[PDB]
Structure 1
Amino acid sequence: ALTNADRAEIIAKFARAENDTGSPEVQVALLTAQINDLQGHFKAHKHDHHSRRGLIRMVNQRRKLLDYLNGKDHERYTALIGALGLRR
C-alpha cells in the first residue's frame, strides 16, 4: 500500500495552488497511483472479488473526473493525461 509521504509527494507534484487537494489533476493522479499499486495485489489474489468492486469504482471515478476536465478545458486535460501516461 502507498504511504502518507507518497501521497504528499503526488499532491506536491500535481497541485495547482497551495493547499490544492481537490483539483481534478490531483485526484486523478492519486487514483492512478492507487490503481497501479493494487494491480500487484490482484496479480496474487485472482478470486478476491470484493476488492475488485472498489477497484472498478476507482476506475469509474477517474473516468468521470477526466471527462469533466476535458469538458472544462482541453489543454489541462491533455497535459494531465500526458504526464500520467493514459491513452484517453
Structure 2
Amino acid sequence: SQERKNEIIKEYARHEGDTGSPEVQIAVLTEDINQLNEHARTHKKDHHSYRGLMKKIGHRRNLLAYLRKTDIQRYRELIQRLGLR
C-alpha cells in the first residue's frame, strides 16, 4: 500500500528525499514478498502471480549482492533490521 510504503521509506531511508536506495527497495520488497507468500498459500493455483513473486525475490537478491559487495556493515545492519538470512 502507498501509506505502508511511505512509512517504510521514512523508516529505512537515509533521508526523506532518498526514496531510491538498496535498503529502501529491499525493505519494500520484503513486505511485498510476505504479502505475496500469504496470498500464494491462500491461492496456491495462481502461478501467474508466483512468477512476479520470484521476480521480486531475484531483484531483492541482486540488491543484497550489491550491498555485500560495497558495504558489508550496511549489509549486516540492514539484515539485522529486516530479519533475513
Q: TM-score, normalised by structure 1?
A: 0.93
Q: Higher mean Cα deviation, 58-67 or 36-45?
A: 36-45
| Gap regions ≥5 residues in structure 1 | none
- Please tell me the root mean square deviation across aligned C-alpha atoms, in Å: 0.8
* Aligned counterpart in structure 1 of residue 64 of structure 2, from 51, 61, 66: 66
Instruction: Give secondary structure in 2 for the equivalent of 1:67.
Output: helix
The one-letter amino acid of 1:72's match is T
Q: How many residues align?
A: 85
- Output the TM-score relative to the length of structure 2: 0.96
The answer to whether the 8 Å contact 2:9/2:16 transfers is: no
1:21 CA displacement: 1.2
Q: 1:51 aligns with which of 49, 60, 66?
A: 49
Q: Which runs of 4+ in 1 moved over 3 A?
A: none
